[PDB]
């Protein structure tokens, strides 16, 4: 909710910084396996735990 604990707000803060796509230059590398970010999570799709 609006009423958060400091520990939970740092938990959410990590999950937002992990919910960005791959940089466009990453798959121009030599050992190129990654196409897109498979671990991208959406607020309707998956509910983050908690």
């Amino acid at each position: 909710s609006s009423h958060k604990t400091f520990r939970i707000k740092r938990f959410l803060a990590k999950k937002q910084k992990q919910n960005r796509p791959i940089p466009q230059w990453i798959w121009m590398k030599t050992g190129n396996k990654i196409r897109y970010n498979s671990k991208r999570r959406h607020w309707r799709r998956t509910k983050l735990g908690l």
Binding site: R7, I8, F11, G49, L50
Partner: protein, 86 residues
Amino acid sequence: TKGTSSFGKRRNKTHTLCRRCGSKAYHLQKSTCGKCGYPAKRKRKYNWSAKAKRRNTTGTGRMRHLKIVYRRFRHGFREGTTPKPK
């Protein structure tokens, strides 16, 4: 009303994040972790789950100390000396 309508009343949690093992199984009323038993000194682990063991053993995390013990073992745990400089 036991099914779909009763799911609507699910707004107050029991388990929060445990703080030994990060595992969301720290029961708030009981104040004990269902995954590790936090207030207990001893890690909750059982032999009826050999799969739940390998999820949380020495081969799981970093071994941020236990890897530099393995690397320092092969030179007999030498301490203090430096390699002869130029």
